[PDB]
Amino acid sequence: SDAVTIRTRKVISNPLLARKQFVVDVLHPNRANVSKDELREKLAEVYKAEKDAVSVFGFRTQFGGGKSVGFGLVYNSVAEAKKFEPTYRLVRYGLAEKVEKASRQQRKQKKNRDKKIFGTGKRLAKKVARRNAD
Amino acid sequence: MKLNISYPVNGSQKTFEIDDEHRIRVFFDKRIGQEVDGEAVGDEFKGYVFKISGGNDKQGFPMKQGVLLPTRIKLLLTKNVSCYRPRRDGERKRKSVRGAIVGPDLAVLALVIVKKGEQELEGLTDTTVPKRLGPKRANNIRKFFGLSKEDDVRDFVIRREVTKGEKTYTKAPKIQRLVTPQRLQRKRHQRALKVRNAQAQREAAAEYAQLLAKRLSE
């Protein structure tokens, strides 16, 4: 393969969020696919963007290969890129960390078990220790 | 028949065990609020006077103030009364409860000391416990320490100490209902807002009236 080409269309400036929104389309006549991080770096060197401050999220390849169309947006000043952005995408680009939590059933069971305790249960714990002691 | 004794002068609490039917016979047919003597219940309790406060039967149901006929009856309890705590607004469960007249079927009876005897108790009179929390309102601070109206009670507040693992530091309650420049400023703003709005209304009404008189000069 010789090259892909990335064209940005319908560019909208959104100063309400300090960002620019656009529809990327890439012509990759040979390779297979997009290699999305290469597009992030390419859009970084297109405007001036420091590629950890960009995010392209929507992508789908046209029928019969070659053309892939998606939606992508650039934030200036990567602090706002961490600010006005959903957490799943920031984890997806490695600029955040996924928290681990128990699954929905365990959380619901724990909430509906400590709905049966009034107060801290320190009196209940002390009382049950004393009352099964003798 | 266990006996939960309390001494509220120092706030000490204990449990005692009496297992003779004849040394407990004086306790029968008294409601809560009555007063008994410590003579026939114990030679250790000579001179002590008790008030009957509460208790629980063999099944563990409590006793309710007021109800006679020392049996178990079901009552529809509402908010802000003993023996019940509501789960949502206006809930009134029918709970079963025991009569306040003390009979032989009681399992635990709880008493309050009202006059200490000539001798003392090892775990009750000797033991004393501090109150957990000092006063929080500023006038309650003044009433607790017996202070003046010009005393600046912020310096009398109790500062409880604590060590995290080594680095000791103290904390003190935030005083409530205090004279403060913020409150005086807010009161000043309230007065100024009222008078300014009223004057604006008066002058706009005068302008409307003179406009009407100007219009009706035809």
Binding site: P15, L16, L17, Q21, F84 | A204, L212, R215
Partner: protein, 260 residues
């Protein structure tokens, strides 16, 4: 059913929101405010489905709650604050001003305006009354009430509230020879001049309106909104100036568009 209603499903939203019937099973449900939800436009619809600024619901939540979008010169944070007709929604970080004026076809339009003229707003005075303590007060279609109006402001008429403190400036009468917007029923969004008003006692005084191109029609008086002298409206009219083209010449001009 035991109380009020808080949900508004898709297929039950107002049709002129142009909400896609798939991709979601609920509609914004404009919360209570100045306008009826059947004839309003929430902030989320305006900012999400018209200017394409936000993409999700939380996106426009984060746009609004940074204290940006002002409706009638007052900061709104609610996603479904019901911005209605003749409202003057403004955006600070882009230095842009808007005015909700109905499109010719019937739904809401996005009418850009200068910074001047965005400091006033017309309102159809709907009932004038001697209020409490003997003061007179007018109340218009947008829920505004104004105390001490001029005695010549009568019912079904138009006043001009600016934005600053109310304080109604020069107002309009209601007769023949006056430009008129229409905001309800089949003849929605059509601008013309009153030629005749027939008053039926008992209800629904129909109005005869003649447009720019001599297509007369009639509406009920509830939908009439007088906007000033013929040829001199006090606002900027939307694109096309409200003509209601028939579909044949709509085809004609649309293929006239095609080709350069």
């Amino acid at each position: 059913a035991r109380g009020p209603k808080k949900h508004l499903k898709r297929l039950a939203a107002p049709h002129h929101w142009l909400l896609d019937k798939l991709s979601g099973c609920y509609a914004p449900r404009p919360s209570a405010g100045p306008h009826k939800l059947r004839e309003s436009l929430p902030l989320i619809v305006f900012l999400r489905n018209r200017l394409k600024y936000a993409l999700n619901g939380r996106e426009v939540k984060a746009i609004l709650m940074q204290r940006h979008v002002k409706v009638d010169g007052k900061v709104r944070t609610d996603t479904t604050y019901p911005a209605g007709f003749m409202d003057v929604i403004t955006l600070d970080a882009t230095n842009e001003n808007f005015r909700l004026v109905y499109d010719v076809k019937g739904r809401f339009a996005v009418h850009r305006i200068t910074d001047e003229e965005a400091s006033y707003k017309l309102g159809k005075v709907k009932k004038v009354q001697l209020g409490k303590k003997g003061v007179p007060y007018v109340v218009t279609h947008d829920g505004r009430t104004i105390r001490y109006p001029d005695p010549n402001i009568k019912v079904n008429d138009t006043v001009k509230i600016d934005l600053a403190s109310g304080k109604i400036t020069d107002f309009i009468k209601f007769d023949a020879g006056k430009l008129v917007y229409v905001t309800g029923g089949r003849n929605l969004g059509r601008i013309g001049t009153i030629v005749h008003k027939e008053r039926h006692d008992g209800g629904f005084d129909l109005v005869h309106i003649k447009d720019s191109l001599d297509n007369t029609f009639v509406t009920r008086l509830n939908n009439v909104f007088v906007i000033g002298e013929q040829g001199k409206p006090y606002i900027s009219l939307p694109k096309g100036k409200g003509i209601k083209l028939s579909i044949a010449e709509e085809r004609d001009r649309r293929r006239a568009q095609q080709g350069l």
